[PDB]
Design an enzyme around this catalytic site. Structure first.
Site: not given
Lengths: 234, 234, 234, 117
Positions: C205, C209
């Site tokens: 992350h 995304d």
């Protein structure tokens, strides 16, 4: 087939969210569970009340307020899911504020809906459309960036099937709803094609027990499959 | 819609389990895999031997000893799943002790079944019913709180579908069985409604390889779908 | 039922991979998503071109180059999935090298296919068969042990259904393909038995995304279900 | 080394240049093959004349309806005939027959072009 690389430098905010999620994973315990929710009654209800909500309140609604109000109910009748740890203290809260993700031109800004428990479908859509309109001309402030107790992070419009969303501060449980697909489920002893969608629940084991999260997810599944439970009081 | 919060203080044991699972996640590597197990033969076998076990041994049995004895077999024929790391040492063990979770009035106490490999279905149910009866009048001691090598943590009676249970010390692999649902599975070229239930296996990558855990889960799936494999020797 | 334990000491390399995956989990953020991919067109295509590839190129092909070339396409048209973080720098790369796991007598050695983006199915199979032949007589060198940007770690031949493979350095996204099973999926409004197989995508992350990984997985699903998309340019 | 959409970008750019009559002289030679369109106009067969400086011209034709026997039963599948007028001084008959079969397999199934046959 070229050995070409470059030295592009990112901004400060990418390190800010990166270190924030790193401290969130190093503080909270990553732990998930999933379930499946029938949406055919939601399909029929939206298809029968589209023009009703359009002519009564003036705005367009879809797929989110059902999950939001059900989550608000499940946090009101199970108040340890919203509680967090700040050092050596557990903060039970009666108020619930759903922290909603939405797209912005800079990235992904997270506006928060305030006082969602005593708040109908159309009022939740009014608040969410107001926050999205504020994000349209880039008027998102700082005061609506914290205080969230739950998250209905949208992964359904983009086309996921399962996911395990990282717990973000300062809350303790995040339900990532997913896209609606077609699966021919055996109901009442025969095979029927009913469109479902999977749900996720990444919950800290330091405060939410596994029994608590399983009953919580089953209660949200019953509240979204049948929205008479939320006025029934179960 | 009230801004009311309180300052409730928890007990020492909540911090004890919280720091225990935090050190367990910071020591072991979190890594899971899942599979699906047919239970229709288990349904038929329990439905045909309910009165037989009731009239022979006197106690009631359900849904757990099948998974326990299959796990004991799979640990006897794959002895690296039970082994752990204590510093710079790997402890292969021939004995297997399944660490079973059960509810208690204070919380969730974890009694351990001792010497489960040379032990039938009815004897495992005798030991588990004795431990549950000891937990009924709160007679759980300290000597039966450690030494477990495997865990069949019950999430099936509560109604989960998938889960990723956190590895607890001092073992290295935990199978969280889940609730039995209805799914119309294609078997032998046609669609048939067979009730299955998903399983989990959260295993350390420092000692259990992915091949090892995949073959382990397939062997447990074959042992629970067909309980003649455990006397067959596969 | 014996209390017998031993003191077996492992080798240096087991601690090497153990500390490597521990630093990889402590550096990257563990975060997964899954999807399902139809393989019936792949079944028909392999069944019709088995003798064609055998008589044209001389080697045997199966089940891996379809996923490899689709992943190479999805990394060429989404270049942040291959990029990593080395301190405070993001390294976008145009070249893509798929890091492939294969069995060796000592353990699991990981050879890397070089320059995979401008490279057909049969050329990828030539490179992979050459690397497997080098692993057959144990001729794997050190120069082909690093530089990988993606991983199609095989868990399909061994019989898994879901999995969450740990991110290994120096890449940032690993797709673990799984075994092909039988599920009677509702397509075009009626129930049809089509053999699918689940896929995984464990992505950091800090750089990828959730939208990026979801669109990435959907694009690979469309590229493997229909291999005309990769020449179509979507 | 050029995808479907890039080929359509180049062809639409050339057609747009022909729209306001901006076709130059430098893009009038050097062609090695020709996909001369006879399909929009409604032909069924044709034998297009080889033009310099190339050596093989495929004239695609219009798509019609013919009920073709496939897999042992009669099914109505819309096909279209193709042509290949090739010099015998350099392209042999075996070469052109295998060439036309390969194009037929590549258009019926566009996974062959990434498969490498």
């Amino acid at each position: 087939g070229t050995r070409s690389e470059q030295r592009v430098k990112m901004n400060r905010m990418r390190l800010k969210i990166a270190a924030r999620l790193k401290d969130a994973q190093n503080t909270c315990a990553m732990l998930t569970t999933f379930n499946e929710v029938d949406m055919s009654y939601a399909m029929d209800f939206r298809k029968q009340n589209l023009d009703a909500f359009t002519k009564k309140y003036g705005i367009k609604f879809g797929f989110m307020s059902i999950f939001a109000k059900a989550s608000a109910y499940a946090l009101q009748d199970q108040p340890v899911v919203n509680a967090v740890i700040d050092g050596t203290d557990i903060v039970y809260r009666d108020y619930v504020d759903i922290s909603v993700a939405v797209a912005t031109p800079r990235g992904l800004v997270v506006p928060v809906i305030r006082n969602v428990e005593g708040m109908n479908y159309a009022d939740i859509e009014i608040a969410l459309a107001g926050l999205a309109d504020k994000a349209r001309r880039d008027a998102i402030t700082v005061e609506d960036m914290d205080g969230g107790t739950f998250t209905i992070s949208n992964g359904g419009v983009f086309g996921s099937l399962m996911g395990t969303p990282i717990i973000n501060p300062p809350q303790s449980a995040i339900l990532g709803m997913h896209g609606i697909f077609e699966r021919p489920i055996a109901v009442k002893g025969e095979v029927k094609i009913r469109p479902m969608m999977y749900i996720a629940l990444t919950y800290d084991h330091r405060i939410i027990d596994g029994r608590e999260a399983v009953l919580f997810l089953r209660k949200i599944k019953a509240a979204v499959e049948n929205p008479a439970i939320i006025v029934a009081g179960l």
